[PDB]
Each structure stands twice: as structure tokens, then as C-alpha cells.
Amino acid sequence: METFLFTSESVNEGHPDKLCDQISDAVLDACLEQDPDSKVACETCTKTNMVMVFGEITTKATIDYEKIVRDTCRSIGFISDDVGLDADKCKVLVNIEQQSPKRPEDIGAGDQGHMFGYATDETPELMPLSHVLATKIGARLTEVRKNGTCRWLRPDGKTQVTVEYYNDNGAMVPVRVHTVLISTQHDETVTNDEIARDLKEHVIKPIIPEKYLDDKTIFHLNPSGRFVIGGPHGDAGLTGRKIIIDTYGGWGAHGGGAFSGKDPTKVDRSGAYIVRQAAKSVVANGMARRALVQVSYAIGVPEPLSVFVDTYGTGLIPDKEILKIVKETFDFRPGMMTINLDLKRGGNGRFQKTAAYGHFGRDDPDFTWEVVKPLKWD
Amino acid sequence: METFLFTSESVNEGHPDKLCDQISDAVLDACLEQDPDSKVACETCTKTNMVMVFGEITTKATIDYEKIVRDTCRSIGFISDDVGLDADKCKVLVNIEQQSPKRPEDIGAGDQGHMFGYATDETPELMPLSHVLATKIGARLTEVRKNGTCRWLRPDGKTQVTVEYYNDNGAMVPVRVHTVLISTQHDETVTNDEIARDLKEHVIKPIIPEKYLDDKTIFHLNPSGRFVIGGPHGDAGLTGRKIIIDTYGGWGAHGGGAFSGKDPTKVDRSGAYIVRQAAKSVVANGMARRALVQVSYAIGVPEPLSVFVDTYGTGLIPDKEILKIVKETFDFRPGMMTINLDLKRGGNGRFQKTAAYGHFGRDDPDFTWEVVKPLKWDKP
Ligand SMILES: [Mg+2]
Numbered sequence: 001m002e003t004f005l006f007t008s009e010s011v012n013e014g015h016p017d018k019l020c021d022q023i024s025d026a027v028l029d030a031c032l033e034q035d036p037d038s039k040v041a042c043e044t045c046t047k048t049n050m051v052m053v054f055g056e057i058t059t060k061a062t063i064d065y066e067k068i069v070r071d072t073c074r075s076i077g078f079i080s081d082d083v084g085l086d087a088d089k090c091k092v093l094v095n096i097e098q099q100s101p102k103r104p105e106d107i108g109a110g111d112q113g114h115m116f117g118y119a120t121d122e123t124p125e126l127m128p129l130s131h132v133l134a135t136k137i138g139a140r141l142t143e144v145r146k147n148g149t150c151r152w153l154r155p156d157g158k159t160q161v162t163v164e165y166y167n168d169n170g171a172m173v174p175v176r177v178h179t180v181l182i183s184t185q186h187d188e189t190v191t192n193d194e195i196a197r198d199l200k201e202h203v204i205k206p207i208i209p210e211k212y213l214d215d216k217t218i219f220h221l222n223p224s225g226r227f228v229i230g231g232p233h234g235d236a237g238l239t240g241r242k243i244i245i246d247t248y249g250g251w252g253a254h255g256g257g258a259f260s261g262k263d264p265t266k267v268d269r270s271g272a273y274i275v276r277q278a279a280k281s282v283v284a285n286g287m288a289r290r291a292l293v294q295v296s297y298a299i300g301v302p303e304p305l306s307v308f309v310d311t312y313g314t315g316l317i318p319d320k321e322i323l324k325i326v327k328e329t330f331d332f333r334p335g336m337m338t339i340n341l342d343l344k345r346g347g348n349g350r351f352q353k354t355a356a357y358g359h360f361g362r363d364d365p366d367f368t369w370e371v372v373k374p375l376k377w378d
Numbered sequence: 379m380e381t382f383l384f385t386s387e388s389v390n391e392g393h394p395d396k397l398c399d400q401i402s403d404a405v406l407d408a409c410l411e412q413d414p415d416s417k418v419a420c421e422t423c424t425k426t427n428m429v430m431v432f433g434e435i436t437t438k439a440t441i442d443y444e445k446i447v448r449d450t451c452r453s454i455g456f457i458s459d460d461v462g463l464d465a466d467k468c469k470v471l472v473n474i475e476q477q478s479p480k481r482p483e484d485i486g487a488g489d490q491g492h493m494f495g496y497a498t499d500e501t502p503e504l505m506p507l508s509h510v511l512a513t514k515i516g517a518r519l520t521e522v523r524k525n526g527t528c529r530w531l532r533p534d535g536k537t538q539v540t541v542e543y544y545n546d547n548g549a550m551v552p553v554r555v556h557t558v559l560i561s562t563q564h565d566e567t568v569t570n571d572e573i574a575r576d577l578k579e580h581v582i583k584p585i586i587p588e589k590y591l592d593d594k595t596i597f598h599l600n601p602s603g604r605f606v607i608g609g610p611h612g613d614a615g616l617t618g619r620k621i622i623i624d625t626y627g628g629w630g631a632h633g634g635g636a637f638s639g640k641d642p643t644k645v646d647r648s649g650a651y652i653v654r655q656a657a658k659s660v661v662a663n664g665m666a667r668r669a670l671v672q673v674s675y676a677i678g679v680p681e682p683l684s685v686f687v688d689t690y691g692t693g694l695i696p697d698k699e700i701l702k703i704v705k706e707t708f709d710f711r712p713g714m715m716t717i718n719l720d721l722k723r724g725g726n727g728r729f730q731k732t733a734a735y736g737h738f739g740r741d742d743p744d745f746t747w748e749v750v751k752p753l754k755w756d757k758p
Pocket residue numbers: 017236237238241
């Protein structure tokens with residue numbers, strides 16, 4: 001049986017770049033709660049003992065940007081210089097430019113660009129397994145830190161999973177997990193042997209189906225040694241520096257645009273969310289085992305400049321026919337996408353939830369782009 | 379004939395995110411010029427009337443960080459608040475943490491991660507045409523501004539090209555350019571009709587091969603109207619926010635790591651450069667018409683955790699044998715990659731050149747990863 005190795009990674013919610021994504025989206029959520037039509041382009045940067053928020057917001061809302069920053073940092077676990085950032089003591093520089101302020105079908109794209117959606121039948125959430133496992137291991141690290149299962153953990157860390165795959169006529173069939181890597185922040189209370197045991201038994205084994213683990217699977221557990229201080233300390237983070245972790249883990253494709261800190265009318269976000277929904281609908285409707293969808297835009301133009309569907313030779317009908325069905329079923333105009341995906345509703349940290357552990361493959365009803373649409377094809 | 383549409387974009391050197399890439403790499407170049415063993419992780423951000431450099435540098439060099447910032451901005455054309463940033467008025471916040479400081483094959487990776495390289499026979503530089511045309515239009519906008527051909531241009535702008543492709547048994551065959559988009563910054567001296575004429579005659583016609591243009595090609599030229607102020611004014615830029623423009627324009631794959639501001643020991647950069655060299659060599663040796671290569675690392679480990687080669691069904695020998703030849707020929711260990719691609723050599727703004735209009739498909743001798751390696755194989 002011929003196989004190949006495909007690797008995906010993840011970073012934890014305390015990684016300094018991911019921290020920035022979460023602060024950016026916390027600012028967006030706070031704006032939408034008061035003013036659902038807010039225009040938000042909120043960028044965040046961090047380094048030793050400092051967080052800066054900047055960019056442009058048009059809103060009727062009154063926002064305590066500093067409190068949102070400190071609350072986000074505190075809840076992630078950055079409560080002391082020892083952990084790598086003190087939410088209550090660090091410098092917070094608020095450099096946002098805030099100003100005060102419509103047939104949806106005529107709303108032009110706010111920018112050019114292109115966006116890709118991907119789906120695969122290899123997991124029930126129609127996501128690539130290398131990505132799902134790296135991501136779920138990260139989420140589990142956060143979970144066992146916060147629920148007291150592994151209280152020695154600290155917020156920062158990274159995960160990486162190599163999967164051995166078989167190509168079944170274009171469909172990706174995982175065979176086994178080849179290598180698992182975790183590098184996690186921790187306190188001084190735990191030995192290296194305790195870290196290794198707890199990561200294997202509390203984190204890895206609950207997440208990776210046992211059918212994919214065997215006696216040859218390679219485990220690298222804090223390979224480079226102890227990791228006590230993390231987050232922004234002696235480091236730096238920025239919004240929009242984890243875009244492959246945010247999407248498909250190297251699978252599919254990416255058009256370049258980041259998601260966090262962007263109001264949902266922005267095509268980098270809404271456009272990518274709708275093409276996930278499209279690709280996921282193609283595969284869920286049994287029209288293909290795998291699907292890649294591209295859309296692109298011009299600034300000021302409502303209708304996309306181009307759309308592409310490719311099913312990696314797995315479509316039951318030719319890709320030209322799937323593209324027709326996708327164009328008939330999905331509305332790619334920006335004023336329409338935000339309404340169809342209910343993206344301005346602005347409930348319980350709706351976008352902050354997206355800003356760690358992936359924008360796709362999550363079954364939370366706020367992730368409206370994960371809802372499959374029926375497709376007509378006989 | 380069955381076709382499909384694929385789109386790539388580019389942004390100009392005055393785009394605020396690209397400005398940050400160029401400043402980051404200008405800092406790296408300054409560090410390597412004095413101290414080739416500098417460790418550099420220089421991040422840059424910008425907003426109205428402000429640039430901030432930050433991150434960590436280990437170096438013996440003495441660097442005037444403020445001067446590098448203002449010189450980089452001024453050279454791009456940020457010379458007035460009317461253009462959208464004045465290099466000789468703006469705030470420059472130097473927030474870098476700078477400190478003072480052996481068998482190469484034993485050097486572990488400085489981080490985890492994965493990286494992809496790609497090549498395609500559809501252009502002479504073995505790059506995707508959609509990406510090449512978007513990028514070269516951008517580079518041509520900068521050239522005609524700076525050489526005085528179109529003096530009405532300003533530094534910011536964006537380009538986007540949709541290409542109509544045929545699939546030839548996995549190989550990508552461009553048929554025609556479907557749609558060309560340019561949104562460019564300009565001064566108050568030029569009418570909309572002069573902008574449209576000049577972009578068509580000075581910028582598009584010189585760059586896009588005539589064989590790909592026809593009477594149905596769609597042109598969008600400043601479709602949203604006038605664009606006089608740009609760069610960071612009422613906007614924001616960050617290093618590492620144009621990583622698809624830096625690489626393959628949606629084609630191939632990306633592992634997530636940005637390039638600019640990183641010294642070339644960092645696998646996000648050297649790893650990506652070596653797999654471009656590997657993918658390019660597989661296509662240039664005639665082993666395949668198209669190639670994708672992944673490598674991945676673990677912190678502290680010299681040998682890659684995984685490698686894969688996929689030729690999209692275009693390989694003339696099985697992909698498993700191309701993988702074996704690639705692994706026999708290329709050394710993916712981080713201490714080796716930097717020496718083999720001569721990446722610490724640090725002369726005339728070697729990395730700042732990479733930081734606008736793409737890291738790949740350029741024939742400058744400093745782009746050592748574009749040099750094809752001979753591969754040993756038997757054509758069946
Ligand atoms: Mg980073």
C-alpha cells in the first residue's frame with residue numbers, strides 16, 4: 001500500500017500571535033453587541049509587558065478598549081509576569097482611530113482579493129485529519145489547564161501532527177498517525193516524566209482515535225526542554241499571523257486574507273466563510289469526497305470576478321456542473337453573504353470563539369457557515 | 379474546450395503591510411551586513427503617522443533603527459502627509475529587544491512548523507501565470523513611477539489577474555487572461571481617462587503577453603474611483619500579512635510562516651526557500667510538469683519530521699521515487715540549508731529585495747533558491 005506523510009500544526013490560545021487574534025475579535029464582538037453595523041479593522045500587537053490595539057473602527061458603540069484587552073488577556077491566563085504577561089499591570093496602548101458613521105444586493109466588495117473553501121470526507125466535520133488532530137490537541141491542552149486536570153500547564157504552547165495517508169482515487173484516507181509533537185508552557189511543579197505521562201494519557205490518547213496510534217507512532221513531548229515563560233515575554237505577536245491554523249492546516253488553499261479583527265462584511269472573512277459552506281455542502285451532499293472552491297472580488301463590485309470548483313477527481317458529476325450548482329445555490333455578493341450567514345447577530349463572544357482552535361469544522365451554532373445547504377442534482 | 383478561472387493578486391511596495399515587510403527585511407539586511415550570525419525576528423507595524431519596530435535581535439551590529447525605518451519609507455516614496463506618510467515627520471517607535479550573543483549538521487530547528495514549495499512548467503520561471511502577471515504588473519507600476527514614465531503615480535496600489543486555464547493531464551495550460559484589475563494610488567494632476575490610458579499602454583500592454591489578451595478580456599481600472607492618499611494613513615500595516623503574495627498566489631500550498639524580518643536560520647524562511655528549490659528542480663529536470671513539496675520540523679531536532687512530493691499526476695516516474703531522489707539530493711537540516719543557499723552573505727539589500735513582488739520566480743543571483751540542482755534519474 002503506497003502512502004505519504006502530511007503535517008499540520010496548531011498553536012494554543014496563549015501563543016502571542018493567537019492572543020492578538022483573540023483581542024482583535026474581542027474588540028469586534030464588543031462593537032457588534034452595541035452596533036451590529038460597526039465597521040471594524042482592529043489590529044493587535046504584543047511584546048514584553050505591552051499590548052497595542054490599532055486600526056480603524058466606524059461605530060456608534062462606546063467601547064472600553066483597555067478593559068477588553070485586559071479582560072481577554074486575564075481570561076486566557078496571563079495573570080503574572082512569571083506566566084509571560086500580567087493582564088492587570090502591563091502597558092496597554094489604545095491607538096485605534098474611532099469615528100461615527102443600502103440595498104444589500106448593490107453593496108460592492110470593500111476590497112479585491114480571493115478566498116478558498118475546502119472540505120474532505122475523511123472526518124465527520126469534513127476537515128483534514130492532520131489539522132483536526134493538531135487543533136483538538138491544542139484545545140484539550142487549554143481544557144485540562146482550566147479544569148484542573150493538569151494544573152501545571154501554562155497558556156502558551158504548540159502542537160503538530162503528521163498523518164500517513166492513502167490516496168483513494170483522489171479521496172484522502174488516513175492510515176495512521178506517524179508523529180505527534182507537543183511543546184507546552186508549564187510551571188516549576190512538574191517533572192519532565194510527569195509532563196510526558198500527563199500529555200500522553202490526559203491530552204493525546206483522549207483526542208486521537210486509538211485506531212490511528214500504534215507502537216511505531218513517534219512522540220516528541222517538549223523535545224527542546226523546559227518551557228516556563230511564554231506568551232509575549234521576550235517575543236512578539238501580531239494579528240493575522242496564524243492564517244493556515246485558522247483554516248485548513250496546509251490542505252486546500254489560502255487567498256492570504258486574515259480573519260480576526262474584521263467585521264463580517266469584509267470579503268476576507270465572509271467570502272472565506274461562504275466558500276467553506278459551499279465546499280462542505282458539495283461533500284455533505286455526496287456530490288464529491290473532496291472539494292476546493294475559490295471566489296475573487298474587485299473593490300466596489302458586488303458580483304465575484306471568478307469562481308472555481310475542483311473535486312480532485314472525486315466528483316460524481318463533472319466539476320463544470322458542480323460550479324453551476326454552487327453558483328445557483330450560493331450568493332457571493334457581500335451584502336447578501338452577511339445576511340445569509342447571520343454574521344452581525346453578535347451574541348456570546350461569537351467571533352472571539354473563532355480566534356483560537358480554528359474557524360472551520362466546529363459544530364457550535366454560531367458557526368453558521370458550517371451548516372450544510374441542500375444542493376439540487378437529481 | 380473545458381476551462382476554469384483561477385485568480386491571484388499582488389500589492390504594491392507602498393501597501394502598508396508590504397511597507398512593514400520591507401522595513402523588517404531592511405533591519406535584517408543591516409544586521410547581516412555587520413554580523414552574518416545575527417539572530418533577527420523583527421516585526422513592524424504602522425498606522426497614521428507612525429511606524430513601530432519590535433521583536434528580538436541578537437547581534438554584534440550597531441544599528442541606527444530609526445534611520446533604517448525613515449530611509450526605507452522615504453525610498454518607497456513616503457515623502458509627504460499628502461501621499462499618506464512622511465518619512466521626515468512620522469513617529470518612529472524603536473521597541474526592539476537587542477542583545478549581544480557548532481557542527482552545522484547537528485543544529486536543531488529553532489521551531490516547529492511546515493513549509494511548501496511549488497513549481498509549474500506554465501511559465502519560463504516555473505511559476506503560476508496568474509501570480510506572475512499580478513506581480514509583474516505591480517512591479518511595473520513601481521518602475522514607471524520611479525523612472526518618471528508615469529510621474530502621477532503614488533506608491534500604494536493593488537493588482538489582480540484572473541487566468542482561464544486548461545487541465546492537460548494535471549499540467550496547467552493558460553488559455554487567456556480573463557480579467558485584469560488595477561487599483562493604484564495617484565496624484566491630483568491626472569484625470570480618470572489619463573489614468574486608464576496610461577495603465578493600458580505603459581503598464582498592462584508591456585507586461586501581459588499579447589497571445590493571452592483578446593476583445594473579451596475584462597479590465598477594471600480604479601473601479602472604486604480616485605485613490606490619492608494611501609499607505610498607513612487612516613489604515614494599518616503589519617509584517618507577515620501578505621504571505622500568499624510572497625509565495626504562489628493561491629497555487630501550491632502554504633504552511634503559515636511569514637518570511638520578512640527573520641534571519642535565514644529560521645526554518646519558516648530557509649525551509650520554504652529550499653522546498654521552492656526542490657520543486658523547481660523536479661520540474662526543470664523534466665521529471666514532472668508540476669510539483670508540490672512539503673517539509674516539517676520539530677524544535678530542537680535537525681532532521682525534518684516529514685517530507686512529501688506530489689506531481690499532480692504529471693510525474694514521469696512515481697512520486698515515491700521522486701521523493702527518494704529529492705531526499706537524496708537536498709539537505710533539509712537547518713544548519714545546512716543556510717550554508718547551501720549562502721543566506722548569511724548579506725550584500726546590497728539582499729532580503730529587502732524579496733520583501734515586495736514575491737520571494738520566488740525572480741532571476742536575481744541573490745535569489746540562490748531559484749538555481750536549479752541537477753537530479754539523477756532515468757527517463758522511462
Ligand atoms: Mg509569530
